[PDB]
């Protein structure tokens, strides 16, 4: 006797992929197609709702890091292409009589470029990182892009400083938050809520060490997509920041020539003192406790009677094996290697870093830039939120991994799924149409 | 389990107005739709109003469309009627009862659940 | 409550909260395209309901019985123990089914309609 | 059939097939524009029969007589021997004139419903 | 007259030429933008009379009261002598008391409508 | 055959100072001017 | 036979045939290429 009644507007939805808008609150990643936040954003919790997430399959990192690289790319565009830079340089040693570690790591380097008018030529002293220049065989030397691509000089008044990104909704799609304590990457969260936007998301990039990212709320969280198949990184979540301090110790200037009509090149010039190399301080009993307390979530998965043993990156270039970041608008890439030197059984460490202008970023082959020289001493303090490692009997081995950022956003949007509003459904009632 | 408990008056004259109320416990009182329901001192029953269990639809016999009003308030569990004019052939003993009537997504009812004792009324 | 609040709520009182998902709805190429499908989805949807002759209502009755092989629960369990994400579920595989007699039955109403008003 | 099959079917027999056409209305640059003056066309008519009074109905029956000269054939050449794109060409000249008296009707229409709604 | 000629004209009057104002709401990039947001706006303002249960009229009447607060003039003064623009600033700051009183009203009246039909 | 409608009776207060046709006007010129010249001949060797 | 006006010279007619005729087409000769650098990223392939 029940007749089927039209019901509009029910509270149920299917897991969806869609594009996602951007929010904030001169800077690479100021978006001008980008809207004002709302200072009162909602968030509706869900009682008795256990939505099920895969941090694996979120399709909103996909998003992420294509919004990234455009936003990139549409940065450095406007700016100066130094195509008179690929000429044969002829160099010698900045410091000839120098012992401390930046023996032979800045070449003073003479050429010719171009000037404004045709017809001219200069010459042009400069100094560069030995990481930036390639020996042909003073000696001769080009630069070690020459060979690859083109560099697109950035332009000097865009901060490469991290602002937080809040990403929304369209209409007819909600966001779920997982709230669920300890959630680790997969499977039914319990505290699940609807929000609008996400949290802000401060695009930061760096290799192996999480920088300035979100904390555990009660412990480290270790999660990966397969935790027994040492293919696949794992993302470890600290619940505590540990501080690493880095600096550019020297005072370096900046010179600029022009190089054609409305064309400037901005290079490193003298170095006002000691020639000193860059590091980052972080303190040996806080970087102990956490790597204990990982060890302990790592046991685990592994054995409670599994040695844990943590040791350097072996293999691949220095972006992957070193920990690469942008600190004060320079490139550091440190060492690492005394904070993964040890074996697990049941004041402060100074990494070495060295500094480069010609990069080539997101992994991309083709697109290299140059990165202006920055005036003054350079300081940063950051804080380390997670880390990201690689496994390799009774002896398990990690390593700093990394060097694929899509793990890095996955990090920050592990707790947001999106979904698609399903506004109609049907029910039996004891209700007939007259 | 269920007390519903009829509150009243007692002599009225023709013409008239008098109120009955009912106070009800021991269930839920917003999930059922009530009634009233008069039996004459010397007759038989007979339906006489129902309301929905929001309050927002009421019945009536024709006899009475246009001398009694009934009404209930969800929050106090009070079902109240409301009665004008009040002519001799009013005279009864006026029940409340819990059924009657369903809201499309809960079962058929279609008969009188649950009782009261009953008020007096007397022209 | 808020947007989808009523979600983990039993099918009778999530069925007091239409109105607030229903405005929800509404509320750079791919930022087009998206808004564009948001549109053309929210269209489609309002046809299908104005094709079954709801295009009006939140809550609309008709004349197609429920055939029981779709869902032999009574209305005690689907309207105070389900939510809508679970019947949802359970009846997914005759959505299409139960949309094709609901247009069926329109199409006879109408031209019912008309004959009845052909009556002089 | 499938859509426009009654197409060259008689004007009756094409009447029962309006869903089948009403759902294949909404079923870079370039195709953006076409999608956009889909929707916009699309609301048009919804709009239009909105303000003849047929928000709700494929079959809507109104107040404006036919006025013969329109067209003189009776009933059974019309929706027995002719398609609707026969009928469709024959009375072109006259859609904006018809179209005009359903609109007056329907304000006529609304100023009385609301002058009855008055009555207490 | 044609579009919004009765703009200064008074509220009674203007009443009459609702259908032209109507037929004129729908009549790269940037171009996109404009157009994609005329037509959410228009359709937010169909969901919203569908809402309050007048999806397919220019003149709706419904069950809420005058609270006299949101105006205390008599009708004589408001369709004689005001004209829409005046009224429209006068009421601007209850606006949406009253939409949210319409609201509630069509929820109570549909679930007041489906429990009629559920009479045998 | 453009209309124009009047409007009796109605008193629009203008203000010609924070009227925004002007600024979409300008970007309007700009961008077809710069549209124009993109198709062009660049004169880099001239700089001699 | 296909034409927009088949008695005006001015315009092309488009024959549409029934069945098919193989046309076998051949380069007999076994060519090499070279490649060379032309710049930053950039290489120039030629007949060798
Ligand atoms: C993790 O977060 C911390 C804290 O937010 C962050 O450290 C901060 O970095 C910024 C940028 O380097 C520091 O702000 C600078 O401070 C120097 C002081 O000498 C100023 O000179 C800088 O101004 C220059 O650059 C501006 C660029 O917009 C110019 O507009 C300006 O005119 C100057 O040229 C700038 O104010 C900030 O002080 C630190 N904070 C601390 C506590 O050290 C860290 O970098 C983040 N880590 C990562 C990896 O992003
Ligand atoms: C790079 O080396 C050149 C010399 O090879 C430096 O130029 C000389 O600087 C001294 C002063 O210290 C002058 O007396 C010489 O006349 C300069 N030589 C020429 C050819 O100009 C140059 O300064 C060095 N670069 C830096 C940054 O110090
Ligand atoms: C610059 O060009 C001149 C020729 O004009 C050449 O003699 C000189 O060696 C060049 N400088 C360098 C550093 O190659
Ligand atoms: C030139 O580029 C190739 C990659 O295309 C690289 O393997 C090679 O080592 C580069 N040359 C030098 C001298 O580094
Ligand atoms: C879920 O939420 C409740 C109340 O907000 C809380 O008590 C409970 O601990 C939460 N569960 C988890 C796993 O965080
Ligand atoms: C680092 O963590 C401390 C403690 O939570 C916090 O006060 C500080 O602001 C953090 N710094 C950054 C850059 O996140
Ligand atoms: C972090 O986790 C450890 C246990 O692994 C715990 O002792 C410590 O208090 C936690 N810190 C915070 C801030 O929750
Ligand atoms: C994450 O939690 C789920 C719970 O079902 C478990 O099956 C999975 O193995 C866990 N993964 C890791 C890396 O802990
Ligand atoms: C994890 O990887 C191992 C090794 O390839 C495989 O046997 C196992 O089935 C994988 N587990 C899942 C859940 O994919
Ligand atoms: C970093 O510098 C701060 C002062 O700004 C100091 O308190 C902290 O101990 C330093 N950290 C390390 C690891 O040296
Ligand atoms: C600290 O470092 C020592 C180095 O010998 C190691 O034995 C110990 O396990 C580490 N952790 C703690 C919590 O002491
Ligand atoms: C490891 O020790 C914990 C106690 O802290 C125990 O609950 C767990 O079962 C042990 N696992 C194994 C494999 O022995
Ligand atoms: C880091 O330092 C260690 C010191 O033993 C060295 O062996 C390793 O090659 C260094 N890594 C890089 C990338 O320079
Ligand atoms: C690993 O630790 C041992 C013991 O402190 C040390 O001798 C060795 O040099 C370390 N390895 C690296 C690469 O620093
Ligand atoms: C660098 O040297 C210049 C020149 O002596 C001086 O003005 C400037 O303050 C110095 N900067 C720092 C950070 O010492
Ligand atoms: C969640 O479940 C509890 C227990 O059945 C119920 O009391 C509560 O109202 C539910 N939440 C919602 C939003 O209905
Ligand atoms: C219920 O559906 C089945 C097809 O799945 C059909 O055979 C059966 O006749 C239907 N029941 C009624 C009463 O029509
Ligand atoms: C609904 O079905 C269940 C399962 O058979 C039964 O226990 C329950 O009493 C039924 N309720 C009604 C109202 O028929
Ligand atoms: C729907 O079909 C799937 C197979 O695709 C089956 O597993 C599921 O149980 C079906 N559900 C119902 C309600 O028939
Ligand atoms: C086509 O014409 C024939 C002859 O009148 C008729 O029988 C047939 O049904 C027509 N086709 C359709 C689709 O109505
Ligand atoms: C039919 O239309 C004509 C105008 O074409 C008009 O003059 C005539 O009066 C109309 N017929 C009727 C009955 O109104
Ligand atoms: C319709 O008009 C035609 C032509 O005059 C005539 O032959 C036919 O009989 C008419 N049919 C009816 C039902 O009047
Ligand atoms: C419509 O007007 C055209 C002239 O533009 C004429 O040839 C045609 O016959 C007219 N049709 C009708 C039905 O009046
Ligand atoms: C303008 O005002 C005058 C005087 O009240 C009135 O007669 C006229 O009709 C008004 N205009 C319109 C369009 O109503
Ligand atoms: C009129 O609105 C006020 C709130 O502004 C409210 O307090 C008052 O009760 C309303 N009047 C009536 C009759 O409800
Ligand atoms: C309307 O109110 C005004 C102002 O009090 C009064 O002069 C006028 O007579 C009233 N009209 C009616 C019809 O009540
Ligand atoms: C509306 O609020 C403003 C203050 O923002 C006030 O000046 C105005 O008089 C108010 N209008 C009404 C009709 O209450
Ligand atoms: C194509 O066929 C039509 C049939 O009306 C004829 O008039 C025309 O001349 C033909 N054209 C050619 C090129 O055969
Ligand atoms: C074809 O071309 C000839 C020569 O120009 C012309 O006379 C004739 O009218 C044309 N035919 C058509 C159909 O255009």
């Known amino acids: 006797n029940l007749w089927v009644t039209v019901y509009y507007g029910v509270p149920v939805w299917k897991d969806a992929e869609t594009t996602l808008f951007c929010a904030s609150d001169h800077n690479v990643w100021a978006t001008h197609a980008c809207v004002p936040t709302d200072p009162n954003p909602q968030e509706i919790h869900l009682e008795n709702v256990t939505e099920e997430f895969n941090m694996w399959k979120n399709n909103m990192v996909e998003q992420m890091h294509e919004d990234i690289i455009s936003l990139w790319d549409q940065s450095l565009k406007p700016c100066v292409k130094l195509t008179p830079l690929c000429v044969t340089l002829q160099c010698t040693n900045y410091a000839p009589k120098l012992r401390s570690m930046m023996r032979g790591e800045i070449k003073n380097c003479s050429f010719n470029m171009t000037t404004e008018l045709r017809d001219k030529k200069q010459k042009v002293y400069s100094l560069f990182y030995r990481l930036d220049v390639v020996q042909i065989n003073n000696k001769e030397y080009r630069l070690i892009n020459c060979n690859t691509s083109a560099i697109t000089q950035a332009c000097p008044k865009v901060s490469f400083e991290p602002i937080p990104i809040h990403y929304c909704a369209p209409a007819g799609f909600a966001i779920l938050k997982c709230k669920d304590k300890k959630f680790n990457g997969t499977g039914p969260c319990q505290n699940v809520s609807t929000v609008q936007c996400t949290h802000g998301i401060k695009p930061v990039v760096s290799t192996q060490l999480l920088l300035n990212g979100s904390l555990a709320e009660e412990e480290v969280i270790i999660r990966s997509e397969n935790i027994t198949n040492n293919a696949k990184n794992i993302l470890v979540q600290l619940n505590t920041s540990v501080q690493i301090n880095c600096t550019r110790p020297s005072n370096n200037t900046v010179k600029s020539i022009r190089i054609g009509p409305g064309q400037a090149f901005y290079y490193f010039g003298d170095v006002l003192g000691h020639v000193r190399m860059a590091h980052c301080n972080i303190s040996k009993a806080t970087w102990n406790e956490t790597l204990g307390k990982v060890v302990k979530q790592l046991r685990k998965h592994f054995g409670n009677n599994t040695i844990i043993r943590f040791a350097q990156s072996s293999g691949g270039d220095l972006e992957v094996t070193t920990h690469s970041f942008n600190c004060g608008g320079e490139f550091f890439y440190c060492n690492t290697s005394g904070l993964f030197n040890s074996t697990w059984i049941s004041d402060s460490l100074i990494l070495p870093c060295w500094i480069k202008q010609i990069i080539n970023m997101w992994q991309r082959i083709g697109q290299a830039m140059y990165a202006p020289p920055i005036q003054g001493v350079i300081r940063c303090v950051s804080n380390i939120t997670g880390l990201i490692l690689t496994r390799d009997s009774t002896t398990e081995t990690f390593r700093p991994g990394g060097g694929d950022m899509r793990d890095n956003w996955r990090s920050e949007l592990y707790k947001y799924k999106v979904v698609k509003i399903e506004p109609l459904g049907v029910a039996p009632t004891r209700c007939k149409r007259r | 389990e269920v007390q519903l408990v009829e509150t009243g008056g007692g002599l009225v004259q023709p013409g008239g107005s008098l109120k009955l109320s009912c106070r009800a416990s021991g269930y839920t009182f917003s999930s059922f739709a009530m009634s009233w329901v008069r039996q004459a001192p010397g007759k038989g029953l007979e339906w006489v109003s129902l309301?929905?269990?929001?309050?927002?639809?009421?019945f009536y016999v024709d006899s009475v469309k246009g001398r009694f009003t009934i009404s209930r308030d969800n929050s106090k569990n009070t079902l109240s009627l409301q009665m004008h004019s009040l002519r001799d052939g009013d005279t009864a003993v006026y029940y409340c009862?819990?059924?009657?009537?369903?809201?499309?997504?809960?079962?058929?009812?279609?008969?009188?659940?649950?009782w009261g004792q009953g008020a007096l009324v007397t022209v | 409550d808020g947007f989808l609040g009523a979600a983990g709520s039993t099918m009778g009182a999530a069925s007091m909260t239409l109105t607030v998902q229903a405005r929800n709805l509404l509320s750079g190429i791919k930022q087009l395209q998206a808004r564009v499908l948001a549109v053309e989805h929210y269209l489609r949807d309002q046809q299908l309901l104005g094709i079954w002759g709801c295009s009006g209502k939140l809550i609309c009755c008709t004349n197609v019985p429920w055939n029981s092989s779709w869902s032999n629960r009574n209305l005690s369990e689907i309207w105070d123990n389900m939510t809508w994400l679970q019947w949802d579920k359970e009846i997914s595989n005759y959505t299409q089914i139960i949309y094709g007699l609901l247009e069926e039955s329109q199409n006879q109403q109408e031209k019912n309609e008309q004959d009845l008003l052909a009556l002089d | 059939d499938g859509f426009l099959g009654a197409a060259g079917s008689t004007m009756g027999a094409a009447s029962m097939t309006l869903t089948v056409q009403a759902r294949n209305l909404l079923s870079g640059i370039k195709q953006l524009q076409a999608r956009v003056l889909a929707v916009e066309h699309y609301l048009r008519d919804q709009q239009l029969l909105g303000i003849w009074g047929c928000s709700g109905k494929l079959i809507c029956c109104t107040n404006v007589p036919w006025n013969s000269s329109w067209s003189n054939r009776n009933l059974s050449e019309i929706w027995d021997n002719m398609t609707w794109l026969q009928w469709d060409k024959e009375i072109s000249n006259y859609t904006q004139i018809i179209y005009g008296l359903l609109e007056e009707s329907q304000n006529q229409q609304e100023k009385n419903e609301q002058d009855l709604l008055a009555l207490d | 007259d044609g579009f919004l000629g009765a703009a200064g004209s008074t509220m009674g009057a203007a009443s009459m030429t609702l259908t032209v104002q109507a037929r004129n709401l729908l009549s790269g990039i940037k171009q996109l933008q404009a157009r994609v947001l005329a037509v959410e706006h228009y359709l937010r303002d169909q969901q919203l009379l569908g809402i309050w249960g007048c999806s397919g009229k220019l003149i709706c009447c419904t069950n809420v009261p005058w609270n006299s607060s949101w105006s205390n003039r008599n009708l004589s003064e408001i369709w004689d002598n005001m004209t829409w623009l005046q009224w429209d600033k006068e009421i601007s700051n209850y606006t949406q008391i009253i939409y949210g009183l319409l609201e509630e009203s069509q929820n109570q009246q549909e679930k007041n409508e489906q429990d009629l039909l559920a009479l045998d | 055959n453009p209309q124009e409608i009047h409007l009796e009776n109605v008193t629009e207060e203008f203000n010609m100072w924070k009227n925004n046709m002007v600024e979409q006007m300008h970007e309007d010129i700009i961008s077809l001017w710069d549209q124009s010249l993109k198709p062009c001949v660049k004169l880099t060797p001239l700089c001699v | 036979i296909r034409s927009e006006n088949i008695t005006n010279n001015a315009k092309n007619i488009l024959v549409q045939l029934n069945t098919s005729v193989q046309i076998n087409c051949t380069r007999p000769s076994n060519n090499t290429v070279k490649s060379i650098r032309i710049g930053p990223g950039q290489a120039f392939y030629y007949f060798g």
């Open positions: 309301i929905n269990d929001r309050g927002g639809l009421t």
């Open positions: 009862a819990t059924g009657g009537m369903s809201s499309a997504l809960q079962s058929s009812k279609y008969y009188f659940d649950f």
